[PDB]
Amino acid sequence: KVFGRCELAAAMKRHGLDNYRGYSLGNWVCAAKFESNFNTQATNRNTDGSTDYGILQINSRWWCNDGRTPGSRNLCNIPCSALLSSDITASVNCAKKIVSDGNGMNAWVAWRNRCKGTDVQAWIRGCRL
Ligand SMILES: [Cl-]
Ligand SMILES: [Cl-]
Ligand SMILES: [Cl-]
Ligand SMILES: [Cl-]
Numbered sequence: 001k002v003f004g005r006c007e008l009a010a011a012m013k014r015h016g017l018d019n020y021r022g023y024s025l026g027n028w029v030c031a032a033k034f035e036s037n038f039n040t041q042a043t044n045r046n047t048d049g050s051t052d053y054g055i056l057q058i059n060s061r062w063w064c065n066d067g068r069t070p071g072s073r074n075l076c077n078i079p080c081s082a083l084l085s086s087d088i089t090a091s092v093n094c095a096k097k098i099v100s101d102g103n104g105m106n107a108w109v110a111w112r113n114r115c116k117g118t119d120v121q122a123w124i125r126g127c128r129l
């Protein structure tokens with residue numbers, strides 16, 4: 001599923017991501033924009049052999065099981081395929097664990113490089129939330 005901007009904002013808010021760990025909704029929408037262009041089915045292979053899955057490009061090195069990432073963990077206790085669903089629940093629940101891991105949203109390199117410090121409220125501007 002490819003979400004609309006406000007549609008995704010609303011779904012993220014519904015699932016309790018707005019201001020989660022102090023990160024406003026715009027931060028989450030911005031991260032999703034640059035990780036996946038709002039496409040839940042996005043996948044990308046990393047140089048280390050791990051794969052990133054879903055709207056927030058959650059990595060199989062630590063967070064989900066895909067059966068083909070040697071020496072990895074599955075700290076969200078989910079198959080990586082669950083992160084590709086039209087229903088963002090699994091991605092949101094896992095993102096909550098990731099953002100709580102110590103480095104906040106810096107866990108998402110694209111958030112650090114493209115969202116951090118910017119006017120992230122632009123991402124939810126105009127949305128009925
Ligand atoms: Cl957009
Ligand atoms: Cl915001
Ligand atoms: Cl594996
Ligand atoms: Cl394969």
Ligand SMILES: [Cl-]
Pocket residue numbers: 072073074075
């Ligand atoms: Cl594990």
Ligand SMILES: [Cl-]
Pocket residue numbers: 065066078079080
């Ligand atoms: Cl599994």
Ligand SMILES: [Cl-]
Pocket residue numbers: 011086087088089
């Ligand atoms: Cl949803």
Ligand SMILES: [Cl-]
Pocket residue numbers: 021022103104105
């Ligand atoms: Cl933080």
Ligand code: NA
Pocket residue numbers: 060061062063064065066067069072073074
């Ligand atoms: Na894994």
